[PDB]
């Protein structure tokens, strides 16, 4: 979890915003992926948001349901994800690394062991994207326990005792929902987030890192404004991975061009 | 916090994006406002009676059993209005949309009869209805897409996936998540995140109600066992309900045992499967050994899914009630025995249930015993895939 801390730190002295894209493990294969995210920071990503592929992923719209589908389709299982987290860590000592888990992935060979494994491989947050505040005490306290950074999503509909809950329990950063509904970028958030940022704010809550429809450089600096450390974007990066799957070539330029773009509009 | 207890021992729970959590919690809040109020279970009542035609029949075969020492009652849950059980809680499930001033209405359905039911009881009461089915089962299901379409429901055919129910299930939840200020999530079954495996038994128990009442009434005792089959747990658990506290009758839950569960081409986790969390609930999931939800199989769409209502996954773990399998052959020979020696043209989904009562007077037949099966829904839905079926064959 300190990772972030020291991220946030250098950010503040430099009056800057975070930016964070999203890939999916694997997607398109296990190495043109690990390149996909050498790219991706290389261009100037400040952490990284990782999924490791699900069968069923039910935050998530069309275009990362087919990132998931094209990891499947490379035979990618969250045992090579962990060997590719390795591999990520080894060349990037301190990029922040989340996962973006779903419930059963972690639950499936006992939730301390997961967290564990998180531990070893250097993995500094987690985000069970399924797994509301609620029924979030065991995976908290596994979190906890292993030195991860326990990801809680603030939503646009949250009431004060939500905003009081996620402070207090969460570590690294606050995930700042963009809106209702599933990931995508075609569908960009409605609702001014000023009062919530200020609220977390108030409450010592983790830095706010907005998310979800987030696929331009202008919702970037917008979500900076605001207040938010920055910003998360996985469809719009997707999208990039999607439309180039015949030429790797060009992804990686496209990718860069995109990355690079979006991480200057986190600049002040 | 909730207002209800969300778990049955470790199953259960709201395991749902956070976003959605005001939504369960309402929902919670106005089931639990909405049972305590007069004026809501009179309309409910009224419904049910007047629109469905509760209570529906308890027949006692003679063909089926002749030569046994059983004793077999159906309850012709297959006579409700739409044809199904799935009726009855939709009614209910309808009024509280209404009660939280929503205007519209998702559902999933894999045989097509939750759909119907959901069709039927928003063009009654004024609630604009769209359905996610997966597109195998469109076809398969096809008499109740052309019901469900001209009723003037929206009918979404899903091809993700294995384009079946489960799939159709994480559509109707994507679409809740984005959609949940106008849109009431309508679940067909006993599963999903609290409070819907609570409602859901609650809006079915007048099943199990009737079947005591009648039972008393003809045979003057309880009956020995009460037989359902096992999507998500809604026509079993509301038959169920009213005799968990009866310890003398047996509770028999039937899964689809498809094509053999050796095979691994079946739905049923409960007693094959392993405990884990997906579509909102800590339950029994068909899945890989490092933990991702498998694709289902059965003969009969209403019992194609990787899991199970947390209720079911309680009694079973506590014994209270036992779960078996009947595979598509055994359903199929009993569908076609209660068509050509009771009269009555079943589901397919029902034939499991059936088919194992049948197999515990064949196996035991000098055994005296008072069986009653739920007989959870009519066969026009199925009778141009059994057609289809039973003519490759010759018979
Ligand atoms: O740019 P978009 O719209 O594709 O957003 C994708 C961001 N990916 S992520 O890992 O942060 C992410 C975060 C939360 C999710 O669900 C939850 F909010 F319920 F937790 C799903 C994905
Ligand atoms: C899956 C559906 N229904 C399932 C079903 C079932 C299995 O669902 P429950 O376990 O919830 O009763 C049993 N009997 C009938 C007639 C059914 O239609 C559906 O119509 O969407
Ligand atoms: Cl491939
Ligand atoms: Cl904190
Ligand atoms: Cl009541
Ligand atoms: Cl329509
Ligand atoms: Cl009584
Ligand atoms: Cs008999
Ligand atoms: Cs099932």
Redesign the pocket.
Known sequence: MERYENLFAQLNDRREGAFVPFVTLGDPGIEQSLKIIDTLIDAGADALELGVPFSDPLADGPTIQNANLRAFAAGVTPAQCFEMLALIREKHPTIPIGLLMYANLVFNNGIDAFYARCEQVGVDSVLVADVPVEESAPFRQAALRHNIAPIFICPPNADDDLLRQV?????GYTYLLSRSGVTGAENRGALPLHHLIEKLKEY???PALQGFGISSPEQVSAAVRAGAAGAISGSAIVKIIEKNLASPKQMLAELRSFVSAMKAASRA | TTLLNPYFGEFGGMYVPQILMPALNQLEEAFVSAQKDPEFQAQFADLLKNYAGRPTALTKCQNITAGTRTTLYLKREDLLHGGAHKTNQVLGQALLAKRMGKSEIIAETGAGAHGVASALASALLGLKCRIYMGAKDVERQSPNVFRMRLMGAEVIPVHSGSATLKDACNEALRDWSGSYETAHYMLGTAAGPHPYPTIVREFQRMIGEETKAQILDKEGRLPDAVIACVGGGSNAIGMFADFINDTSVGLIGVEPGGHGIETGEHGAPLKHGRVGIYFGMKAPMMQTADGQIEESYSISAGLDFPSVGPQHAYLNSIGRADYVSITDDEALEAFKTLCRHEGIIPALESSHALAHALKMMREQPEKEQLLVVNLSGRGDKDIFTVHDILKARGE
């Open positions: 402070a207090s329990y969460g570590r010592h809550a983790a």
